[PDB]
Amino acid sequence: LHKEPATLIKAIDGDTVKLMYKGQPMTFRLLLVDTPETKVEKYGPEASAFTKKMNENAKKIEVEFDKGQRTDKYGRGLAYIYADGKMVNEALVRQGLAKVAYVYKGNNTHEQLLRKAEAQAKKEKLNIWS
Structure with missing residues (x-):
């Protein structure tokens, strides 16, 4: 996979953010x-x-x-x-502020990584896992 540059335009909420990507807001x-x-x-x-x-x-x-x-x-x-x-996806799960979601249409490259961050957050009874 490859990382592409973006520019923060505006926060929306925990799982969503407005970014300038390839010159257009998204x-x-x-x-x-x-x-x-x-x-x-x-x-x-x-x-x-x-x-x-x-x-x-x-x-x-x-x-x-x-x-x-x-x-x-x-x-x-x-x-x-x-x-x-x-x-950010991982940071969220690790901080116990989000659960790992069901894989969606083949987008699972980092599922195990987040899976582990989540186990750890739960082990620490952090926030949502309190």
């Missing part, structure tokens, strides 16, 4: 993560603040499409997002 849905709903579920606003802060403080944001379908039915890009080289 909404991205983070692959393989299921955060709590805000629009509220417990930790829903925590997840949103986390994603918002991580992308905001980042010097460089990168988009990494997986090997499966690249956009969902609502026109959102399906990818792994990196903030200064750190994967």
Whole structure:
């Protein structure tokens, strides 16, 4: 897979962010993560603040499409997002602010990696796992 440059335009919530990709604005849905709903579920606003802060403080944001379908039915890009080289999808799961989601249309490259971050968060009874 390859990382492509992007520019943060605006946070939306825990699992979604608006990015300038290839010169055009696009909404991205983070692959393989299921955060709590805000629009509220417990930790829903925590997840949103986390994603918002991580992308905001980042010097460089990168988009990494997986090997499966690249956009969902609502026109959102399906990818792994990196903030200064750190994967937000993974950071979220590791912080116990999101559960790993069902694989979607062959986009499973990082499933095990997130799977492990999640086991650890649960082991630490962190946030959602409290």
